[PDB]
Amino acid sequence: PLDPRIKKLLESVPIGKASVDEVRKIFRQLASAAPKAEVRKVEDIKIPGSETSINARVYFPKAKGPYGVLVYLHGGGFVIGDVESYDPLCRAITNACNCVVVSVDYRLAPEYKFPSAVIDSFDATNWIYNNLDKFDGEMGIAIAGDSAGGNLAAVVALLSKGKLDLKYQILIYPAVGFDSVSRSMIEYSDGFFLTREHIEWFGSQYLRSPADLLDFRFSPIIAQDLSGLPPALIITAEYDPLRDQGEAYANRLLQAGVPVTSVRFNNVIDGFLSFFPLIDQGKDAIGLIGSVLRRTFYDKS
């Protein structure tokens, strides 16, 4: 069953039942309420994308350099969330990993439909890779994101094959495609924060036509070839409609020879890392991310 702490929280975001502005506001005020841990320095930068100037926030850790750079792609169903609402989480990640985090403000639907978010996420990652020196970030680049952001991270890792050298991909309860059949999708369709109705709504805002459902840049699970992708940490949540598809992607990556640590956090829901001050499991997931990136970037415990 759910951790009673989470059940209590749930029993006390109106996606598809309020305006885009209102749902964005509700989400901002929820996510941004978490404590902001001190980092060494924060900078807002503009990354010159192929289709837009991409705002990003750069967090520097108190540890001395050189650093690895983690590109972070926020969740929010391709429609809500932003860099500023993810500031608490990105600060926590920065401190856990002792690395630079660059959180990307990719273009959001419905104003900018698929594949805008993908293009911005990839363009940002490409630019950061080519400018690691600016961050004292010579230990390399990794990519991470949660939920819809995990979709984008997975897709960026695919697009980066034979171009960038991503050291790692961190997929935090990712969406990896269109799922009308998995047990978790059916069983946890309602009552666990992220619902099937929300997922369908987000899909309706982001995608342009049903054809986009078959585009690997939306459904990385059907990519022709997953071999040669960066090693992955894939976190799933037990009570999450997206759980089974995330674990399927982990399995597909493993079958393609990609190293994957797939961990199901029991008793929790989609989005639980954003709840880290309330949900201890969220802190522990952040710590797991920390371990994996300190090892990959620095060969440190």
Q: How far is the CB of 96 from ligand BOG (least distance, A)?
A: 24
Figure out which of the listed residues 19, 64, 133, 210 binds ligand BOG, where binding follows CB under 6 A. 210
Identify which range of 35-43, 52-60, 184-192, 194-202 contacts ligand BOG by CB under 6 A. 194-202
Which residues bind to its own copies, rule: CB under 8 A? 176-177, 179-183, 185-186, 210-211, 213-214, 219, 221-222, 244-245, 247-248, 251-252
Q: Which is nearer to its own copies, 54 or 250 (CB)?
A: 250
Among 200, 252, 261, 280, binds ligand BOG (CB under 6 A): 200
Nearer to ligand BOG, 204 or 266 (CB): 204
Q: Which is nearer to ligand BOG, 20 or 42 (CB)?
A: 20
**Residue 211 binds: one of ligand BOG, its own copies, none (C-beta under 5 to 8 A by kind):** its own copies
User: Which range binds ligand BOG by CB under 6 A, 25-33, 101-109, 207-215, 281-289?
Assistant: 207-215
Tell me: does residue 203 bind ligand BOG (CB under 6 A). yes
Number of residues that bind ligand BOG (CB under 6 A): 13
Show the 3-state SS of the chain: CCCHHHHHHHHCCCCCCCCHHHHHHHHHHHHCCCCCCCCCEEEEEEEECCCCEEEEEEEECCCCCCCEEEEEECCCCCCCCCCCCCHHHHHHHHHHHCCEEEEECCCCCCCCCCCHHHHHHHHHHHHHHHCHHHHCCCCEEEEEEECHHHHHHHHHHHHHCCCCCEEEEEEECCCCCCCCCCHHHHHCCCCCCCCHHHHHHHHHHHCCCHHHHHCCCCCHHHCCCCCCCCCEEEEEEEECCCHHHHHHHHHHHHHCCCCEEEEEEEEEECCHHHHCCCCHHHHHHHHHHHHHHHHHHHCCC
Beta bridge partners of 262: 234
- Binders of ligand BOG among residues 65 to 94 (CB under 6 A) are 77
Looking at 50, 130, 131, 204, which residue binds ligand BOG (CB under 6 A)? 204
Q: Which is nearer to ligand BOG, 271 or 290 (CB)?
A: 271
**Does residue 114 touch ligand BOG according to CB under 6 A?**
no
- Which chain residues interact with ligand BOG by CB under 6 A? 77, 147-148, 175, 178, 199-200, 202-204, 207, 210, 213
